Design a binder for this molecule. Structure first.
Ligand SMILES: O=C1Cc2cc(Nc3ncnc(Cl)c3Cl)ccc2N1
Ligand SMILES: O=C1Cc2cc(Nc3ncnc(Cl)c3Cl)ccc2N1
Ligand SMILES: [Cl-]
Ligand SMILES: [Cl-]
Lengths: 4, 124, 124, 4
């Protein structure tokens, strides 16, 4: 999971 | 927004759509390319091809279970492009590049047309 | 093999499937969550959810145009998860995390369940 | 395009  | 994003989600979805295609699950159309038949999902074809997007947004053609392609279309070139639609991988070889490029032009798959042009230019 | 790969292909396919969903094109099922209704593509739901994969591979349920979820399922939690299925982006907030995790557990979306557990653990 |  990432900060887009 | 303040959303979080799962990096591998799009790839995982496409992998599962290909698994459903291999097991012939919820495929709703057969693409006829001369003597050869290819089963697929209309939504995936529309998502990958400008030609299929036009065909399946048409009020009469959206309901057809069989689509016949132009007789000049090579079945192997179509098979390679269908595999690309479902996997992101293109089996481009010296022996098939001309058929793949002509099929990608007909199907309106601009990124495939672009890489075929570049690979051809390099060989000249 | 000796294939070449287009990095953005899976993301581009998913973006187009979401555009078809927004315009209600070739959606073949309505998911009923108490008073709320959500239109979607069966193939995408199966590709993202262990519960929908089980439902639509069932010889009788594969043909249903309406699926009713358990009454304990929160419509907002479902909406957030449906948006995630079609975009890879999860709108996870303090006010919705419990409903999102419970819906992801029911839908069998293991990567969503995992991030909800981690975000909850950090707040404890 | 890349070599996967
Ligand atoms: O080279 C390409 C690949 C392609 C796909 C599509 N597909 C869609 N485009 C916009 N909205 C929607 Cl909803 C879809 Cl399905 C249209 C044109 C082209 N051209
Ligand atoms: O957490 C998850 C996400 C998910 C999706 C699916 N989907 C598929 N799996 C295998 N082959 C096929 Cl053909 C599909 Cl469609 C099944 C289980 C789960 N669990
Ligand atoms: Cl393309
Ligand atoms: Cl997930």
């Amino acid at each position: 999971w990432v900060i887009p | 927004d303040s959303c979080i994003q799962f990096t591998r989600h799009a790839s995982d979805v496409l992998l599962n759509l290909n698994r459903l295609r291999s097991r012939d699950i919820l495929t709703d159309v057969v693409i006829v390319v001369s003597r050869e038949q290819f089963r697929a999902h209309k939504t995936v074809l529309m998502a990958c091809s400008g030609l299929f997007y036009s065909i399946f947004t048409d009020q009469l053609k959206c309901n057809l279970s069989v689509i016949n392609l132009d007789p000049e279309i090579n079945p192997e070139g179509f098979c390679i492009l269908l595999d690309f639609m479902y996997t992101s991988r293109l089996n481009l070889r010296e022996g098939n590049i001309m058929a793949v490029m002509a099929t990608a032009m007909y199907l309106q798959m601009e990124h495939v047309v672009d890489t075929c042009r570049k690979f051809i230019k390099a060989s000249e």
